[PDB]
Amino acid sequence: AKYTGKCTKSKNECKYKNDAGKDTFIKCPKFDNKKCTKDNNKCTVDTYNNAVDCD
Ligand SMILES: CCOCCOCCOCCO
Numbered sequence: 001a002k003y004t005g006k007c008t009k010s011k012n013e014c015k016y017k018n019d020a021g022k023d024t025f026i027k028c029p030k031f032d033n034k035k036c037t038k039d040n041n042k043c044t045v046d047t048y049n050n051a052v053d054c055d
């Protein structure tokens, strides 16, 4: 169950619209390769594994 969203740099968060059409925010990791490095970069959310990867 995979989603693409957009991340924000200040809050280091991923915003994705879930299957119900509801916008949901979830934290990006602190790790270098998974943090949001720029506003409006892509991010992915795997709700099966509950894993977030921001760019
Ligand atoms: C606001 C939530 O704070 C949780 C702090 O716990 C530290 C654990 O590190 C994060 C592991 O994914």
Ligand code: NA
Binding pocket: 033, 034, 035, 053, 054, 055
């Ligand atoms: Na990334």
